Amino acid sequence: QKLIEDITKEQLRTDLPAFRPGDTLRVHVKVVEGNRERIQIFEGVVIKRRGGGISETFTVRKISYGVGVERTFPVHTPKIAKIEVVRYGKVRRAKLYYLRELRGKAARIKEIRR
Amino acid sequence: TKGILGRKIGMTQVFAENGDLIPVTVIEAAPNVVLQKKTAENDGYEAIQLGFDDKREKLSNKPEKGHVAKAETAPKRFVKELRGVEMDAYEVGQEVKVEIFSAGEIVDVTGVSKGKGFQGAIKRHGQSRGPMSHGSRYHRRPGSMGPVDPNRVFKGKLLPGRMGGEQITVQNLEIVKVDAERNLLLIKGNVPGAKKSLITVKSAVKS
Amino acid sequence: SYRKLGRTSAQRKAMLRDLTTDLIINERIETTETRAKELRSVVEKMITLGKRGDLHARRQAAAYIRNEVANEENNQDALQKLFSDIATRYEERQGGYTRIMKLGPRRGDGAPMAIIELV
Amino acid sequence: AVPFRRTSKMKKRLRRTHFKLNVPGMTECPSCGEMKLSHRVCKACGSYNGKDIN
Amino acid sequence: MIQQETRLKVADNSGAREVLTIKVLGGSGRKTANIGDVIVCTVKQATPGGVVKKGEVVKAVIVRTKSGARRSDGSYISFDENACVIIRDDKSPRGTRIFGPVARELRENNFMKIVSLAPEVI
Amino acid sequence: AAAAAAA
RNA sequence: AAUGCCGGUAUGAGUAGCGAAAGAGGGGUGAGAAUCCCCUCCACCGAAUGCCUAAGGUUUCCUGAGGAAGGCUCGUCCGC
């Protein structure tokens, strides 16, 4: 798969900070509404980090108005303008599927400060 | 028309000029050497022969070595005809490369599909499945062969057998990017066949 | 893809451990050909584990080597034999510690037999 | 699942055309012979290219 | 992926609380609808104070699903619940207020007033 | 009747 | 020419089956060993798949040879 790596090495997004699959961060998403492009902030905890180089995707989950919203972005997309890590969490596994049923303090007692 | 034939490597994803994400199939398809030109006054039709992926002299026969002696090239693994190209526009031994395709064009992609082995009627023909409960002993079976009156099964009754290994053509795919340095074609969409198998990319029937 | 050899996965693991350890003591065993082909990669992986010589590789090898006596009147276990004789014998060689030599078919079931040896 | 008619002798012999089995890949053993099937150790001398390995 | 006999909660101030899907309106046809499709549905549970009563056969458009809706940029969105907003047989909602987040795919259709009445559009 | 109940 | 009786031999056909559930290796005997003996691991039952004691069978128990037929395969082994 080294030829795929040489193809997609030019389009990797190398300015993004490194983040673990168990911390909270905010995503600056560029959305086109017509004509002005507002940048909405999506703060929430990372749930997934599924690898594959250019096919790498990450999932961010937040609770908005009592309904949980899961949103998945590819890592190297140009739609994301900037990624800032709010705080680092201490987790025991790379997939956080358990906390999408643990409202609300039961997720807070698991996402402790690192 | 124009066309070229080669080996596909695998699939990847490429975003291009926007935020949109495109599934991309990677094909090594260069260089191709013109081996034989078919003429109407001798062969009865107009076509050209393209050779790809030259091999060692140990794996080639003496007729294979003599057939490529006219084109001044090594013997090649894959030989296929293209019909009908714009006659003549190519001489015998001229290298066909990936520069003939621009990265906005619409092409036809054909190849031998992946083998599935001897499979049942549910997977091979998409037939619906019998009930698993309410006393039923019937599931995963092809069905009734037909009526009683002909005293025979009609030809074309769909039955379990070998799936795959046949030539499949996918129409109207789009070239995402062309790589002249590394001999690569980036094609939007899915391409039939397994990895490192022979893929022929020809220009689509427009319009 | 690995072979199933007509066994349950637990039976597969037990039979592979038995054949690996029995090859490690007796240094030449005669099995079927497909059992030899499934056994040789596991045996060279365990020899590679014995190459390192550290405590963690030895504790990895202890989870696979069964507790049978290797050398008589010396009280040497097989796990000591990997890290004393086989690793020092194959220090220069990089892979290919076993070879398979085919024999004729068996009388009782027509099974093609093979000789396995540490080389 | 019941045979309507019995099979005749000629149809049975035509079905038994491919029931025969082939001659094995047997070759001259370079040590003693004779003979030795290909890619196996010789049962007579116990040699294989060309050491006596038994 | 909203099906026949799928129970959705109602995410506006119309009065209904839980509703049961009768039919997907697209085509002859499909048995599944995801986001932005209009479904015929009947009210199973409702508040005592509200214009919509129990047992009424109404029309609603899906605003939230837990199935991952795909966008052109490779992004995905999914919720923890299935929700819908009841409409007066055109694309205007019954209730004056809308609760909960709303997916952006309603803006691709001409669903402007439900998006404008939403507290948050993702 | 013609009941298929052969034993 | 009785869906006749008896005996012999075909077709189906080298086809179905070979009857719950762990074996592996190294030595030994032998003309012949996946099936017999020994050893070392591994596995199963364990309010039993353990011990004995009726009914019942009656020699099937032990030793030394043997392998024809019977072990739904083999057999140097056996309740033969």
Place this chain on the structure above:
RNA sequence: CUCAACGAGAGACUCGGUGAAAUUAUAGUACCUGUGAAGAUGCAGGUUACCCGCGACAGGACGGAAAGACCCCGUGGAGC
């Protein structure tokens, strides 16, 4: 189920050993339309089809298995 997709084991598949049964007038045993005891592999006219196997399905051979159990007859019988 919509709507099915994988994974494990046993059989089925291949090889080695052993190895039946129901059935069976002989058989070099296509299709369509007619004809015929009125529903044809064997008849007529036409249309197709090199020879021999292996793995599958079961439309036909009014398939096999039981001298239909229903209905009727017997100057039959049996039980009430």
Place this chain on the structure above:
RNA sequence: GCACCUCGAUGUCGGCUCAUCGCAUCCUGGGGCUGUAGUCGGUCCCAAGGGUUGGGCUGUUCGCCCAUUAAAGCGGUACGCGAGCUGGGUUCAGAACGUCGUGAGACAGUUCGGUCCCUAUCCGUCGCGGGCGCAGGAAAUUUGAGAGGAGCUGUCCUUAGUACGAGAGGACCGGGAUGGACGCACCGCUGGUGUACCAGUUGUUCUGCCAAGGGCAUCGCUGGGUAGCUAUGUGCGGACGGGAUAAGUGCUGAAAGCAUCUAAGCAUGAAGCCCCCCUCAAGAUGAGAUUUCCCAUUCCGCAAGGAAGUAAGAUCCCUGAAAGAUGAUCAGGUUGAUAGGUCUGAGGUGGAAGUGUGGCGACACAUGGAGCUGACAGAUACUAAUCGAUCGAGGACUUAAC
């Protein structure tokens, strides 16, 4: 209705699965007449190419109702299909209700419960092989006689609120997007699975013990997951068009000085037809065609012809999968990366053991994105693809030029 065939057995309703055929056409396509102003309609033609739904009730077909749709069409095929499937109802043996009968019992009156066997011989169908032929033996590439697949359509915007219409209402034709169902491929995403991947954890047993591990308890259970296979995921298709046409619309025209779609000659005209789209196709015994190798030995048979060795080439045997039940196909066999091992990576899991620190301890922290890793890549002959053997042609005769 009759009783021609079957009582030394032709399984009978309704559903499930798989379909196929005919239009007396439900929609879509093309038209005539309309008391057709336009949309929507009515009737009658040509047209089977494609498609003709999800439920509630009842064993039910049918039927009624709810919600859609372009429409939810009629029938035949043993009221298609039980050696393909179910027995809810009819249709056994038990027991009740109502009625009739003194009674045993009876009821196309009702209700509860009630054994559905078959290892495919032949023809048929779906796939895969081995021979021989195709006047020499081979390796490739192919034309196409023929055959199969596909064929469906909704909504929105313009033209245009235009034509038409007092208003309300509202186009034909022509363009551009977006869907439903179906089909073909493939997973790069989203997920599923992933019994030789990683981690946590319970009970018992074992490695003499702690620590660390092994066995069994559904893979013991739980949380994830590589490759492969997958849809519910993604990409694509039914596009634009030619020729002869059906119903219709006609042109020029006489029989019959007129008239006339026709008797001669020319058109136009449909989702029908034959192609263009895809696939199999020279066993198409009518066995085709192009390119390139190998050559014309020996011995008998005076002729025909027959044996032995061989060239080009292929096979036996072996390593394997992009293939696969087995054959077959494909990549390869020591001037070589075919598989395994080794090394370095990708991905997965999540911070190994040991040591040290803090705590009475359960435990946490550092060494340390650590340790481990099945099929995923790239290098590397370390191991196995050894030596070998078998098959494989000397090219018939006429006719025109050479």
